[model samples]
Target: GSHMRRVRLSEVRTTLLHNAQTMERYYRQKGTFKTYDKNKLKQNKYFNVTLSKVSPDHFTLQADPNPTTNDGETCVVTLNDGGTIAASGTNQSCPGFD
Candidate 1:
C-alpha cells in the first residue's frame, strides 16, 4: 500500500533558504560545503540533502526526496555559495555570481 501526502513550493522554498543560510555560514569558516550528516539536517522526514558539485570556492547544497520520484524529472531544491536559491530542477545555473 502507498500513502498520500502533500508538498508545497512555498514551504520548501522557505526551508531551502534557511538551509542555504546555514551552509553559507558554515562554509565561510570551513571553506567547503558539508554533507547532510555534517550539516545536521539529514534526519528530516521529507528530504535528503547533499552538497553537490562542490569545491572550496563554490558548491550547491541540494535537497531531494529520499525515495526519489518525479516522473523522470530532475527536481531539486538548491542553495549555493553564490547566493542562489531555487526549488526547480530545470534551471541548472547557480543564479548568482557563480
Candidate 2:
C-alpha cells in the first residue's frame, strides 16, 4: 500500500510564499485579486501544492501527493491577510481534497 510521505514545512512555506507573491503581483497589475486554485496548482509540474480559497484575503495551502508518485502527506497551511502563515497542521487530511 502507498503511504504518506513527509513533506518539509520549510518547503511548504516556500511554495505558499511563491504562489502568494505571484497572486499579489497579479492583483497589483490587474487591479483585482487573483487566486491559485487547486486545479491550477494541480497542473504545476514542479510541486504538489493544492490550494483552496477561504475568503478574499485568506486561503489554504496543502502539500498533497505528487501526480507521478501518488504518495504524499497532506500538510495544511493557511495564508492570512498580512502575508503570514496564519495556521498549519501536519499529517492531516486537507479539506475538499481529502
Candidate 3:
C-alpha cells in the first residue's frame, strides 16, 4: 500500500510568508537579497519546501510532500519584496522550473 500526506495549502502559505519576512528583513539589513536554502524549513513534518529566486525582488516557493509520493500534491506560491504573496496555486508549474 502507498501512503500520502494531505498538506493544506494555507499551511504552505503560512510558512512561505514567514520565510518571505525573514528574507525581507535580511535584505533590509544587508542591502541585498539573501541566498535561500531549500532545506531551511526541514522541520516541517509533512512537506519539503523549496525556495528559488525569481528576480531581485521576487521568489517562488514550492512545497512537495515529504517522503515523496505519487499524489502530485505539490503547491507553489510567489512572494515579493514586501513579504506579500503575489500568486499561489496547487499542482501547477512553477516559474523558474520552466
Candidate 4:
C-alpha cells in the first residue's frame, strides 16, 4: 500500500479554478471564510498534496499533475522537485513518483 502526504500551495503559490468545483462548499465545512477585516467567504483555487504510486515508478505525469502545470513538474519527471528536494524513496516523504 502507498502512503499519503501533503503538497502545500506554500513555498510557492498558484491556483487553477477547477471546473470540477470541489471547494465550493468548503467555507461551510470550515464554518466560516470571512474575517473581521475582510470577506472570508470566497472562492479560490487551492489544492492539497498527496502521495501515491507512480504508474510503475517514473511515469510521464501530466504537465500539470498537481493543480496547474505552471507550478510543479515540467516534462519527463525522473526526479522529485526537479531532483532538488534531497530525498530518496524511503517511507512516506514526498509524492511517490506520481
The weakest ten consecutive residues by lDDT in model 4 span: 55-64
What is candidate 2's TM-score against the reference?
0.51
* 1-98 per-residue lDDT for model 1 (tens digits): 11222243334555666766776777677766533245464333456667666665677767675454323333567777777776554443222212
TM-score winner between candidates 3 and 4: 3
Could you give me the TM-score of model 1 versus the true structure? 0.54
Model 3 alpha-carbon drift over 4 Å, by segment: 1-7, 34-43, 54-57, 67-72, 82-98
Q: Looking at candidate 2, what is the lDDT of residue 13?
A: 60
Among all candidates shown, the one with the greatest lDDT: 1
TM-score of each predicted structure versus truth: 0.54, 0.51, 0.55, 0.16
Residue 41's C-alpha lDDT in candidate 3? Answer: 44
Off by over 4 Å in 2: 1-7, 34-47, 54-60, 65-74, 90-98
Error of 1 at 31 (Å): 4.1
lDDT of 3 by residue, 14-86 (tens): 7666776776676677665545444564324455666655455566555555544424544444455555564
lDDT of 4 by residue, 1-86 (tens): 32222343222122212211222344335443221112221222333322122332221111123446334322112212222222
Candidate 2 lDDT, 1-98, residue by residue in tens: 22222334445566667777766665576554444344544222324665555455555554444546443544445554366674333655443223
Give the alpha-carbon lDDT of every model: 0.55, 0.50, 0.52, 0.26
Among residues 3 or more apart in sequence or in different chains, the pairs in candidate 4 whose N, CA or C atoms overlap within 3 Å are: 7-49, 33-40, 33-41, 34-40
Better-scoring candidate (TM-score), 1 or 2: 1
